[PDB]
Amino acid sequence: KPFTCLDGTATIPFDQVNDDYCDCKDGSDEPGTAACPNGSFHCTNTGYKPLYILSSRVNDGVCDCCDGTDEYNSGTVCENTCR
């Protein structure tokens, strides 16, 4: 059952995936949070070109994705601007 970092540096239970603490040197355990310094967040931008942003831009209060999915618990409510 456990998760293995995409770089092979550690094996952790699934409960340490998106748990808002960085456990992988490549940041692969935190794709959905701002916890890893070298992670990436995927902007799905449904109906337009997808983009990846720095993990430090997830819930920073700034609208980075045109779909606004990077801001889900920050207090900034982002509007969909993909067109």
Next chain:
Amino acid sequence: VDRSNFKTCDESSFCKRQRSIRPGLSPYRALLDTLQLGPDALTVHLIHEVTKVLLVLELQGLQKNMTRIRIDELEPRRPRYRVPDVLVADPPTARLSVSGRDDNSVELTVAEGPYKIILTAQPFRLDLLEDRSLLLSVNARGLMAFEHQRAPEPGAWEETFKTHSDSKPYGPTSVGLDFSLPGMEHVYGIPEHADSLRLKVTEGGEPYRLYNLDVFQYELNNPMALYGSVPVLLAHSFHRDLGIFWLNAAETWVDISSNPQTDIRWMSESGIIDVFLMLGPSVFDVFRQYASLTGTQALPPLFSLGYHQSRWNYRDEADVLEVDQGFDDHNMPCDVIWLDIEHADGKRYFTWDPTRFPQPLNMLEHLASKRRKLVAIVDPHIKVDSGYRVHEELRNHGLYVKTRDGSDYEGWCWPGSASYPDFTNPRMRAWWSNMFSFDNYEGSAPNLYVWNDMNEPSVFNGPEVTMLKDAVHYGGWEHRDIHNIYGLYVHMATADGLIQRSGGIERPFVLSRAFFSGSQRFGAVWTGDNTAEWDHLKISIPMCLSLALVGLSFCGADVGGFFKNPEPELLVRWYQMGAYQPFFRAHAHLDTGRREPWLLASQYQDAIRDALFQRYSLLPFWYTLFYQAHKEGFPVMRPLWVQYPEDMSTFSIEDQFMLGDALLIHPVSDAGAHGVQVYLPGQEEVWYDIQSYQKHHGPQTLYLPVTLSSIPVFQRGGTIVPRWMRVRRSSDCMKDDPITLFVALSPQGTAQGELFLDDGHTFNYQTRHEFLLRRFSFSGSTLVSSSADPKGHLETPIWIERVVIMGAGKPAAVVLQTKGSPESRLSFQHDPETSVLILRKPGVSVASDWSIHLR
């Protein structure tokens, strides 16, 4: 510098007259039959034996180990100036009791002891003691000189400097007095000078000069007066600390001489003799004493402690937005972008160029969407233009400084012909504050802050590039009487403007060039127009340390140097130095090439990004040091001798400094350096290299190897430093993030540190007690979080995500206890080579009490 544009002591008639008096028997004597003693003061008449002029001495013991001495004429032709608005309160007094008296002396006890004052009648002298220890003598060399006001001697009356004639209606009125400091060999302070931290003896040269002046291309290691003046001198020895605060706003010269004993002489153009003797005994006692008189450092809004990007000038709105986007495209944090004088309509302040900045509110809204701020320049000179509303209003209300003939003074400055508002007039200050309302300053918004430059005041065609000595201010006082507080009033009125525009809720951010005692209450200062050279990078340490010692903790120097083009290596080293100094701004002159940090080659960009990330991660530590400065009046940036007062090898160090009691910084400041000599003080002290975690025992000089990305920083054993390890694009983005605690164990296995948190920008910490002040303490295998101030409560999502312990062995288990939760087991990682233990995700609120036990 063009030294011929600035007076030497021989070219200032009052300095030449005062300095010509050499040590001897004073002609002043106290008339003890006139002695009167009350609960608040002792008063006695003094007489000059030759001229028969009568003066009045008002001698006071004060609470917190201070003494105040005031001397004025008994029957003056006209009142002498007494400095207003610098003192924050009428200082609480201590009663003087006569414990001894004869025909030539009176011994006074302060309260119930141990301090005593001996007044000798002939020659007039004061001796200040603690029990049988003589601390200081006054008029010991008989250099007291009080030029009485004569009926309204080369240059004693009318006096010319170059083509400028000072009409000098009141003639010679200078005052001066000497102080002797037995056992003292090291003295500091009296900024602003581009000189050494430990002050030099002035015997064979010029005295130090305190006269706020705009000095173009100023040079290093000399006593010429620069932009600000703080008339406070500190004296340090192994045994004691003392301070002298000479409360006078006129041009002042300070002579320093050695014998072990240091003698100090103050010579001022006008006003009274008003001096505070701050008797310590520790340097922290002196800081508290001075803070009781002039207040403490205003708590900066958090964003102002981030990185500021400036130049003269960003071209237009598109350039500002491109610079903003450049920081984000290159993953470099930045809180503020600055707009110099070209943003205005032809240097009419409070306006916007209609081609370059047509939509300032839209520019401010875009910066607000990135959680960034802007700073706009507003100088205290107003273009003479009948179409300019600010000029028309000030002219119509008579709020400008006047010449003797009653006409509004007009000089030359950035807008060409300009007038100078009289900031000493309280109605002019009220008008100025009101001009910052969002309705009056059209195009401004809450994320727009202010920079006051040229507030000495700078007058391009004036004597010494400033205002005429005989210009007239509020109440009929001459410019010579008030000069050194003009800039402080500009700073004060601007800060009040930013507070009032928000309805009193938002903390201000104002940078000022000119300053005086009390300027710490209004914002930040910087060392002015420095140059892109290695020696100017080096001198930023003693200049900001001299300011820190006299209460001005929010100091910095232009990163990269203002004048000329720095080589990339120098720009990198300057970012690293600036990253560890309180006010961190890159700024550059009009004719320099662009130097936004992403314009350099990748190796240099990477070293600069590293320095920015270090600074941003340390913001919780910086904010806490500023909270301690605001509450106690203790400096943020400190000389090593403040922390190691008995280590005589630290007394003159100026290539290294400390931040609080926890970090020791030795920035690289030479081209092609491959190592630095770091002095790590302290008997039984340990220091951790914050990058490698290597432990070093003090006292020692360590030769540390360095590369381009190196910033030599050591954490003292016994301290706990808080950091935000998730570096984002600006401080607003980070201010609700989790904290990592860096625990550096002492040889006894202990450590402590504090953490201040609030909303980052309002006065709610003071009006609603909405803040947290935590104490973290480590001893005997347990780390504990407790409240350091139970009055402070704050709703915050901030939690503890990690603990890094340096100097720890490998535990078998790590247990966390917190009220309201069951006991928790934490995972950990340990490096046996460095003895570094990392505790994974404690997960506890920073507002809660908790304990972590190892084994």
